Amino acid sequence: DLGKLAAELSPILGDNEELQLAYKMVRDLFVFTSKRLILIDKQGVTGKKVSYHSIPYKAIVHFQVETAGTFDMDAELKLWISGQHEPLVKELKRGTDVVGIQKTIARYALG
Amino acid sequence: GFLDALMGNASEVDLGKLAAELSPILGDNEELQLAYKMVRDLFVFTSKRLILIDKQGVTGKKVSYHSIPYKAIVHFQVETAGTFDMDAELKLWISGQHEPLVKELKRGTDVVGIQKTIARYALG
Amino acid sequence: MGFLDALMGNASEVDLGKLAAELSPILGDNEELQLAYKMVRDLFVFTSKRLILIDKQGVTGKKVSYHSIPYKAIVHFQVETAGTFDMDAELKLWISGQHEPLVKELKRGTDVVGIQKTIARYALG
Amino acid sequence: VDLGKLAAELSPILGDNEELQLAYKMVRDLFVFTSKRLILIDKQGVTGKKVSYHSIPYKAIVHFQVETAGTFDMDAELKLWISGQHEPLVKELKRGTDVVGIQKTIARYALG
Amino acid sequence: EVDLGKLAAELSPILGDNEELQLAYKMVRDLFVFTSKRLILIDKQGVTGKKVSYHSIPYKAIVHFQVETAGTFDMDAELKLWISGQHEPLVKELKRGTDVVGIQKTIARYALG
């Protein structure tokens, strides 16, 4: 829900920045603004910590979706961030918008 | 129709069929433009990125769609023995990465078309 | 204003006039200080051209470090809940060429929300 | 180097609107400067079985160095640091190589 | 050797067409020469000075930089300059009595514009 979300995030958004799309991942929230991808996660030994990882779109230097199998396929998203050897890795679970998120990442990363 | 491909212009890949199939993961502002076959795999050139589509595993049932934005291709290289027996190799270096993406270009692959096409999009 | 907005701003406030007078020998003639945040152990100085991150370093804390970070060098950044009681925050700034982030403590009571907004403003924009 | 001949021989991998401008031939390396990139062609050494064709757009050349090398510092060594790398591309410019020319040409293309 | 004219005589053949020498600083082991297009580090080594390197750093390749004060009297203030495409920073002692503040201002003028 973009409304509860804009209300929560607004104090750390730029003045002209706007929330445009959001996707619920397994443990993550993928928040697409006009300027950056914000990954909102639950960290810690339990789940008390919260992280907001701001990724400007020009920092997404390559990305990949890999599926395994024919029926009931596994799908995994990899997003490589400039300067990082390891990619961010996200399961595209039996519950995630597999195609939408790829189209959105493409839309923002390619411009 | 490989001979049809040779004999002038005709892409060896069915570009129309490929566009229909990839449509759900392409941007509304994005067009499929050219594609080359590397054995069972594909080098797909859109108006915005190179998409490497590789079938992996014994069955070829594990498929990766690896997208490289043209603006992120920093430099590139083909190492080749021409028509001596050996295969060629492509290296693509990507912005803010350290190691290149490495792809074998098996003998018979249109390595010259791939190179010229990369130059077209990576310079632009 | 919110009940604590005024105080949080004063808590990490620095006199820019005094700071400009002292930093001016190393600033470009076309450079102005715009904002500054005095956090727990670091002074974040936002100029029109770079973040100058100032802190004490050395084996016995006798050195002073002036780290100039042009805004174009900030590749990505993260803020996370920090501290045993989960009151504070930890900022990670990834600078171009460095695979490890600069890690900085931000304490509740200071302008933690403000500094995140400022980083977003300059790095994005 | 006959530039007209080289331009025709490289034409299959050049853009239609790309001009070959200058070329420098070393022992195992051929530095080709086009309007759009340096194509560094390395035909390798005595155990070589392939040729490397390395296209380096000028904007990827982030800094560079020439240093004296060899016995009595009569040869030179070129280092080209390229965007995204940790370590440079290293090439030997033996005495008799156009060391000053190559340096000036890189300055003209890589500065901006 | 910080005479800009002598540095021009030495560097002329490798300079671009409308490139001018503007400032030069003597460091402990090299020279930082600021041209209108690049920082050129000149290191002439040995007793005979035969081993020479010219390291050209376009100003856009200066990613970030840091100056740390000495702290104690047996140490120098230190400059680190991180350059694109090179993992390790360039590290240079800023010796007492030299233009320690000036070189920082110069780096900021050229790198930041």
- CATH number for the domain including C39? 2.30.29.50
Contact indicator for A83, C75 with CB cutoff of 8 Å? yes
The CA angle A37-A41-A44, to the nearest 5 degrees, is 145
Token pair 């560079």 in the structure block, residue = D64
Q: Could you tell me which of C107, C95, C76 has the C-alpha nearest to residue A39?
A: C76
What is the largest distance, in Å, between two alpha-carbon atoms of chain E? Answer: 46
Residues 6+ apart with CB under 8 A from E65: C67, C68, E79, E80, E81, E82, E107, E111
Residues 6+ apart with CB under 8 A from A42: A27, A49, A50
Q: Could you tell me which of C82, C102, C113 has the C-alpha nearest to residue A44?
A: C82
Backbone angles phi, psi at E36, to 5 degrees: -65, -10
Q: What CA–CA distance (Å, rounded) separates B61 from A69?
A: 5
Residue type (1 letter), E29: R
Token pair 């620095």 in the structure block, residue = C14
What is the largest distance, in Å, between two alpha-carbon atoms of chain A? Answer: 46
Token pair 């000028």 in the structure block, residue = D58
> Which tokens go with B115?
């190179």
> Which tokens go with A97?
């918008």
Give, in order, the Cα–Cα distances in Å from D15 to each of B37, C79, D18: 21, 46, 5
Q: What CA–CA distance (Å, rounded) separates B110 from B101?
A: 19
CA distance E44 to chain C (A): 28
> Which tokens go with D65?
């160095």
Give, in order, the Cα–Cα distances in Å from A26 to each of A59, A91, B102, E93: 23, 7, 31, 51
C-beta atoms of A62 and B65 within 8 A = no
C-beta atoms of A82 and B68 within 8 A = no
Give, in order, the Cα–Cα distances in Å from E79 to each of C65, E67, E71, E87, E96: 10, 5, 14, 16, 13
CA atoms within 13 A on the CB side of B43: 21
Rg for chain D (alpha carbons), in Å?
A: 14
Question: Residue E76 CB: number of other CB atoms within 10 A?
Answer: 18
Q: What CA–CA distance (Å, rounded) separates B53 from B56?
A: 10
Which residue among C25, C28, C97 sits closest to E112, beta carbon to beta carbon? C28
- First and final C-alpha spacing in chain B: 32
What approach was used to elucidate this structure? X-ray
Contacts 24+ apart (CB under 8 A), B12-16: B12/B36, B12/B37, B12/B110, B13/B37, B13/B42
Backbone angles phi, psi at A13, to 5 degrees: -90, 150
Q: What CA–CA distance (Å, rounded) separates C44 from B24?
A: 45
Which residue among B27, B63, B101 sits closest to A103, beta carbon to beta carbon? B27
Q: Could you tell me which of E66, B100, A69 has the C-alpha nearest to residue C70?
A: E66
Chain A residues close to C1, C-beta within 8 Å: none
Query: How does DSSP classify residue D95?
Result: B
Q: What CA–CA distance (Å, rounded) separates D79 from E62?
A: 17
Query: How does DSSP classify residue D87?
Result: S
Report the side by side order of strands in the sheet with A19-24: A19-24, A28-33, A36-43, A49-56, C74-82, C88-95, C102-106
Contact indicator for D50, B81 with CB cutoff of 8 Å? yes
**3-state SS assignment for residue A77:** strand
Contact indicator for D32, D41 with CB cutoff of 8 Å? yes
Q: What CA–CA distance (Å, rounded) separates D38 from E92?
A: 32
- Domain interval for residue C108: 2-125
- E82 Cβ under 8 Å from any chain C Cβ: yes
The CA angle B94-C71-B71, to the nearest 5 degrees, is 25
- B75 Cβ under 8 Å from any chain A Cβ: no
Contact indicator for B45, B33 with CB cutoff of 8 Å? yes
Chain A residues close to C79, C-beta within 8 Å: 12, 51-52, 54
Report the side by side order of strands in the sheet with E62-68: C33-38, C42-47, C50-57, C63-70, E62-68, E77-83, E90-94
Contact indicator for E54, D76 with CB cutoff of 8 Å? no
C-beta atoms of B119 and D13 within 8 A = yes
- Is the alpha carbon torsion for E83, E85, E87, E88 positive or negative? negative
C-beta atoms of E108 and C58 within 8 A = no
C-beta atoms of A81 and C76 within 8 A = yes
Contact indicator for B117, B50 with CB cutoff of 8 Å? no
C-beta atoms of E15 and D110 within 8 A = no
Contact indicator for E13, D100 with CB cutoff of 8 Å? yes
> Which tokens go with D62?
């982030």
Size of interface A-C (CB pairs under 8 A): 71
Number of domains in chain B: 1
